Design a protein around this motif. Structure first.
Motif, PDB file in Angstrom:
ATOM      1  N   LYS A  55       0.849  -1.168   0.000  1.00  0.00           N
ATOM      2  CA  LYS A  55       0.000   0.000   0.000  1.00  0.00           C
ATOM      3  C   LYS A  55       0.887   1.220   0.000  1.00  0.00           C
ATOM      4  N   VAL A  56       0.686   2.114  -0.993  1.00  0.00           N
ATOM      5  CA  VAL A  56       1.412   3.359  -1.097  1.00  0.00           C
ATOM      6  C   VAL A  56       0.407   4.412  -1.476  1.00  0.00           C
ATOM      7  N   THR A  57       0.754   5.692  -1.219  1.00  0.00           N
ATOM      8  CA  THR A  57      -0.016   6.838  -1.644  1.00  0.00           C
ATOM      9  C   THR A  57       0.849   7.532  -2.667  1.00  0.00           C
ATOM     10  N   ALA A  58       0.237   8.003  -3.775  1.00  0.00           N
ATOM     11  CA  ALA A  58       0.961   8.617  -4.861  1.00  0.00           C
ATOM     12  C   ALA A  58       0.261   9.888  -5.242  1.00  0.00           C
ATOM     13  N   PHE A  59       1.055  10.943  -5.528  1.00  0.00           N
ATOM     14  CA  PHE A  59       0.597  12.244  -5.959  1.00  0.00           C
ATOM     15  C   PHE A  59       0.294  12.145  -7.434  1.00  0.00           C
ATOM     16  N   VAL A  60      -0.889  12.642  -7.863  1.00  0.00           N
ATOM     17  CA  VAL A  60      -1.266  12.674  -9.260  1.00  0.00           C
ATOM     18  C   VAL A  60      -1.333  14.131  -9.685  1.00  0.00           C
ATOM     19  N   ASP A  73      -8.612   1.664 -11.172  1.00  0.00           N
ATOM     20  CA  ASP A  73      -7.820   2.116 -12.293  1.00  0.00           C
ATOM     21  C   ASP A  73      -6.513   1.365 -12.257  1.00  0.00           C
ATOM     22  N   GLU A  74      -6.050   0.878 -13.429  1.00  0.00           N
ATOM     23  CA  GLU A  74      -4.764   0.243 -13.583  1.00  0.00           C
ATOM     24  C   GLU A  74      -3.766   1.308 -13.946  1.00  0.00           C
ATOM     25  N   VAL A  75      -3.222   1.974 -12.906  1.00  0.00           N
ATOM     26  CA  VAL A  75      -2.383   3.137 -13.041  1.00  0.00           C
ATOM     27  C   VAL A  75      -0.939   2.714 -12.911  1.00  0.00           C
ATOM     28  N   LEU A  76      -0.027   3.407 -13.634  1.00  0.00           N
ATOM     29  CA  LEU A  76       1.394   3.169 -13.546  1.00  0.00           C
ATOM     30  C   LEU A  76       1.968   4.159 -12.553  1.00  0.00           C
ATOM     31  N   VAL A  97       2.405   9.817 -10.257  1.00  0.00           N
ATOM     32  CA  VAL A  97       1.597   9.048 -11.175  1.00  0.00           C
ATOM     33  C   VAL A  97       1.979   9.427 -12.586  1.00  0.00           C
ATOM     34  N   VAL A  98       2.069   8.407 -13.471  1.00  0.00           N
ATOM     35  CA  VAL A  98       2.448   8.541 -14.859  1.00  0.00           C
ATOM     36  C   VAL A  98       1.169   8.609 -15.668  1.00  0.00           C
ATOM     37  N   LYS A  99       1.210   9.267 -16.850  1.00  0.00           N
ATOM     38  CA  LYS A  99       0.066   9.450 -17.713  1.00  0.00           C
ATOM     39  C   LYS A  99       0.008   8.315 -18.704  1.00  0.00           C
ATOM     40  N   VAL A 100      -1.229   7.946 -19.139  1.00  0.00           N
ATOM     41  CA  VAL A 100      -1.588   7.021 -20.213  1.00  0.00           C
ATOM     42  C   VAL A 100      -0.653   5.851 -20.452  1.00  0.00           C
ATOM     43  N   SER A 101      -0.467   4.978 -19.436  1.00  0.00           N
ATOM     44  CA  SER A 101       0.543   3.946 -19.515  1.00  0.00           C
ATOM     45  C   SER A 101       0.106   2.702 -18.795  1.00  0.00           C
ATOM     46  N   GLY A 102       0.891   1.616 -18.987  1.00  0.00           N
ATOM     47  CA  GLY A 102       0.640   0.302 -18.446  1.00  0.00           C
ATOM     48  C   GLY A 102       0.183  -0.581 -19.566  1.00  0.00           C
ATOM     49  N   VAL A 103      -0.553  -1.661 -19.225  1.00  0.00           N
ATOM     50  CA  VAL A 103      -1.099  -2.604 -20.180  1.00  0.00           C
ATOM     51  C   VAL A 103      -2.387  -2.036 -20.734  1.00  0.00           C
ATOM     52  N   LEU A 105      -3.934   1.173 -20.035  1.00  0.00           N
ATOM     53  CA  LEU A 105      -3.919   2.598 -20.338  1.00  0.00           C
ATOM     54  C   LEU A 105      -5.244   3.249 -19.990  1.00  0.00           C
ATOM     55  N   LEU A 106      -5.615   3.239 -18.689  1.00  0.00           N
ATOM     56  CA  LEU A 106      -6.893   3.750 -18.239  1.00  0.00           C
ATOM     57  C   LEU A 106      -6.758   5.191 -17.822  1.00  0.00           C
ATOM     58  N   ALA A 107      -5.721   5.512 -17.011  1.00  0.00           N
ATOM     59  CA  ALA A 107      -5.488   6.841 -16.489  1.00  0.00           C
ATOM     60  C   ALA A 107      -5.136   7.818 -17.585  1.00  0.00           C
ATOM     61  N   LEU A 108      -5.827   8.982 -17.622  1.00  0.00           N
ATOM     62  CA  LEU A 108      -5.739   9.911 -18.728  1.00  0.00           C
ATOM     63  C   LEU A 108      -4.606  10.895 -18.549  1.00  0.00           C
ATOM     64  N   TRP A 109      -4.327  11.664 -19.627  1.00  0.00           N
ATOM     65  CA  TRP A 109      -3.226  12.594 -19.721  1.00  0.00           C
ATOM     66  C   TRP A 109      -3.654  13.972 -19.281  1.00  0.00           C
ATOM     67  N   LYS A 110      -2.801  14.991 -19.542  1.00  0.00           N
ATOM     68  CA  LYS A 110      -3.076  16.369 -19.212  1.00  0.00           C
ATOM     69  C   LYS A 110      -3.960  16.966 -20.282  1.00  0.00           C
TER      70      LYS A 110
END
Lengths: 118, 125
Positions: A55-60, A73-76, A97-103, A105-110
């Motif tokens: 368990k981690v907390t990440a800044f988006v 969300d399957e976030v990178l 948090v990284v944009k539009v990535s992984g297998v 690609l659910l999390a959106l960009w800027k």
RNA sequence: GCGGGAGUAACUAUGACUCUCUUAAGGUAGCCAAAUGCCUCGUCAUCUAAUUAGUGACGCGCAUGAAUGGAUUAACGAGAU
RNA sequence: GAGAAUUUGGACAAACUUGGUCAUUUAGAGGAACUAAAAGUCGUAACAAGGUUUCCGUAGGUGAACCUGCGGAAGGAUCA
RNA sequence: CCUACCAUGGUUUCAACGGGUACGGGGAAUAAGGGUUCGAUUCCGGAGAGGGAGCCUGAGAAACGGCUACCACAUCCAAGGAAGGCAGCAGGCGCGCAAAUUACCCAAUCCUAAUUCAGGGAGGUAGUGACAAUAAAUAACGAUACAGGGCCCAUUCGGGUCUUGUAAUUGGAAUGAGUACAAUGUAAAUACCUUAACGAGGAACAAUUGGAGGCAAGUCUGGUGCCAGCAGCCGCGGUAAUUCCAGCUCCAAUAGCGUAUAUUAAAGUUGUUGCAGUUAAAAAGCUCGUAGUUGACUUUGGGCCCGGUUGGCCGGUCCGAUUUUUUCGUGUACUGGAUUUCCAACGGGGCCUUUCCUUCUGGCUAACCUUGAGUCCUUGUGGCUCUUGGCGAACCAGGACUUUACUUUGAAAAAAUUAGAGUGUUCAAAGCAGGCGUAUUGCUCGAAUAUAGCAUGGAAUAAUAGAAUAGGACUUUGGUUCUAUUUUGUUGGUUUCUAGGACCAUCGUAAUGAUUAGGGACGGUCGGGGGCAUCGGUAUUCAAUUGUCGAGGUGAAAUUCUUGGAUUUAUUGAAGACUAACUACUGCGAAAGCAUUUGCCAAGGACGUUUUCAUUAAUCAAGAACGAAAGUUAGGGGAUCGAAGAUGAUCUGGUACCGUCGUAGUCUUAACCAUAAACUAUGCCGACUAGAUCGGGUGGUGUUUUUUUAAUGACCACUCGGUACCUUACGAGAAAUCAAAGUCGGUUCUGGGGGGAGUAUGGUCGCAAGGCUGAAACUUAAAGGAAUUGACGGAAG
């Protein structure tokens, strides 16, 4: 042999292995406040990893306040706070948090901006 | 006995004593001081009677910058002299290391001429 | 022998602290639902074909409290789950 | 005389099952503590000689920072 | 390898055994090197083939595509019963930050089978992706017209050099790729290479990413208003934002740019090379001593050990072919790098060893490594001279030659001198050297072995016994007998030579240079070092008695004590503790610690002429013993003051300061726990470098004290140890300061940002309070030292 007991340098990261990034299925999208010198509500997500299972907390950061990184969300997840020190305003986060990535690609960009990408 | 030795003669040159007053006698003192004589670092010397051991006499001429011992007497090789000569002598060209070679006690560059290894005593520059 | 009434902290929610009345004057270290609890199948975890015991705590103390004493703490039994 | 199959005996290797003992991980009634965070409560402890000089060790006691006994230090000027 | 029997050993703090972790090396990355971190690709070695077991076949297997029984899985089946193992290639599913086609082929190399030739998912190739390096690189030319600002020169009229714009400008040239035709090499397949001519198309195959407050090249204007947002660090955003956001405006690099991972550098921040400890983090409370580490010293060879330098493998260069500095092959030389273990030669360093020695008696017998100097020859350097290649001298290094010399003894009146003898042994070969053909002898070279004699042992000499070897006489040829030589054992006289044991003197001079380094005996001496047993004085308190009437406290007060005679004054008696003055800028004890006087047992330091054992020493993890105060246990004791506890006062409160009382403690024996801001905040031990005071020993041919004159003195010269310490130059340091805490070694302890923490947990000790050993998650961006200015004080002048 002789030496005093030296410890090797340790990155303050609860995921390990030999991997740059990591996938994570997430629990919730939070909007937590910060420490003394600065205000504003800064957005975060509760990323739970698949391989490591920590368990981690990440800044988006994003040009979208309620940008899409939902509950499932399957976030990178990358560094920033692993690299350097952990962030002053909102502590605890040391993952960005990284944009539009992984297998998936659910999390959106800027969005809503038309300068060069990033 | 090794520690005190080269510090006494060095501090004599620092203040500017013309002769230095030093003493002991048994059989690891005087022929590298003849290597110092050959190189022109000191002058003449003689012996004076005592009750026990002996008394030396050494004539100086204001040459020594710092001499001092190498307190553990390490192994020197006929290649690796100059790993020591780097730190021992802060100047190269000036000074020399005195090795206790297999061919007696002589100079370090003389030791390369004979092609002989050994231990070390001290530096002079 | 060892108190009542009234008011009070962002926000669900609570009273640190403060005032007032009354009396001779209002309790510490440490512990709790008892050989003592009206209220109570209270409230939660684990166990069990059901399992409230085993064992894990909750706080909602009708009514815990240092010498005819709290508390540290090993050995022993035709005595108790 | 040979081969196959069966029976008895000897010795070797390792597994499987049951019981005892030790270490590690996860779940977990329950219990104790810390760090960060606005406002509060109670006292003025520390800070000038803060109007009893402080601090540290140790022992006893108190709603409370604390107070007191005993020793010492300069972390009060000067070598007390 | 295995069993039976026997012995009870083997391993281990130089780390057994256990637990956790891990394939190993050539090597790869980073670095100046030292080192630190890794063990991908390649290459070499080991181990494994669903799990567990066993065997056969065979030269080789307890066998990936071999076999049998058993178990679990998934699959087929007529339900009787069978058939399977991708840690081989391509691919499927699941895991994940994430990693490629169910392709082509035997040509080439190599392996397998007389050759032909066949097989190879080995391999040789292709496809996929900026994955990286590399080159082309993100584009650049000859000529002309016009406008603006800056600089040289100027006859001031212009001319020269030179480019952020501009023009349907003009001449064009140019790659990479496709297409048609020609020409070429290997083919089983996919995509063909190269040059020239002509035509056509596209065009250097669309340039983006990042930064602009400091660190880190680069600013202005709008919009938004702690929101939207950015953040590696410190931070920015709540109205004039160079930090957000957009523009135009700038900087840096570019087919890459930024981020993320992780190692190394930065880091001398784990210090081998190459670190600190008076105040910043850091000397253990102090002694003592074992293992361990280190070692003053004379003369030596051998033995043992450490450390090289040189040769063996690979790469480059040299040689040949070739266009080549590509590349391949062979031989030799040079140079550089690597695996770190063996052999051998050559000079060391560190490690180890005696005056003397049976006895009447004579005293008897014998001797040194080497250093140094001289001479000759050889090498290198420098000068003079030659276009450059010759010459004389000095000096360095190597080799050879070289005695005078050294010594035990005799003859001498002494003595010059002289006469004789000596200066290791043995074996094999090869070279040179006397006389001869040789043999052989001597020397040198190389090895092995050993390095004061007379108790003892060897040889010479003699005897005897056994064995071996050689020659002669014999032999019924086996053998006997005699002689010579060697070896082994034993005994005796004499001659010569070698080991070993006890005890003592001196410190001479050549290889680190003003050195008495450890223990005391003898004789004087100082001190509050210790324990016990006595004794004395002052003050306080209590008890009894006399003379005499109120006191004690405080800022004011009261609790409290007094007419039941207090305070008090004196006398008498008792109980406990402490020792004013002397008392210090003093002395002692390793530190803790140690104050009346006297006596006993008993310890340590310093001084003095010496006498004396002869490295015996230094330091020391563990270990052992000792321990201020406070606390605990059992038995005593309680005068003088008092934590806790009970009243009075003070204050907003007063669980305190203050005042009246008072419990445990405080004292004592025995036993325990063992700590202090336990202090010089400075470890111990030894040598170098100018300047007080206390104790001992010596001197003052002069003066004083003074009647057992001991003046121990006065006062001055020194010479030694402790060295309250003061003060200071050189020198060091960040500085205050130090006077070594400057600076050095041998050895031991200890430090690596603050908080969490001397805590958690285990072990261990304790009767118990508690001690000793001893972290992490996590939080944060600083904590801290030295030195300054100013305000303020119930501070002073």
């Amino acid at each position: 042999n002789y030496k005093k007991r030296l410890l090797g340098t340790a990155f303050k990261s609860s995921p390990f292995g030999g991997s740059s990034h990591a996938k994570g299925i997430v629990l919730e999208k939070l909007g937590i406040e910060s420490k003394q010198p600065n205000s504003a509500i800064r957005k975060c997500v509760r990323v739970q990893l698949i391989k490591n299972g920590k368990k981690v907390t990440a800044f988006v950061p994003n040009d979208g306040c309620l940008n899409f990184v939902d509950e499932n969300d399957e976030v990178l997840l990358a560094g920033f706070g692993r690299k350097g020190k952990a962030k002053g305003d909102i502590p605890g986060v040391r993952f960005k948090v990284v944009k539009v990535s992984g297998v998936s690609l659910l999390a959106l960009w800027k969005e809503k901006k038309e300068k060069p990408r990033s | 006995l090794l520690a005190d030795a080269l510090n006494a003669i060095n501090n004599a040159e620092k203040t500017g004593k013309r002769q230095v007053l030093i003493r002991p006698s048994s059989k690891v003192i005087i022929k590298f001081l003849q290597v110092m004589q050959k190189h022109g670092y000191i002058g003449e010397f003689e012996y004076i009677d005592d009750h026990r051991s002996g008394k030396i006499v050494v004539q100086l001429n204001g040459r020594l910058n710092k001499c001092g011992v190498i307190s553990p007497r390490f192994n020197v090789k006929i290649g690796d002299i100059e790993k020591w000569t780097a730190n021992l002598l802060p100047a190269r060209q000036f000074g020399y290391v005195i090795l206790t070679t297999s061919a007696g006690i002589m100079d370090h560059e003389e030791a390369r001429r004979k092609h002989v290894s050994g231990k070390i005593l001290g530096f002079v520059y």
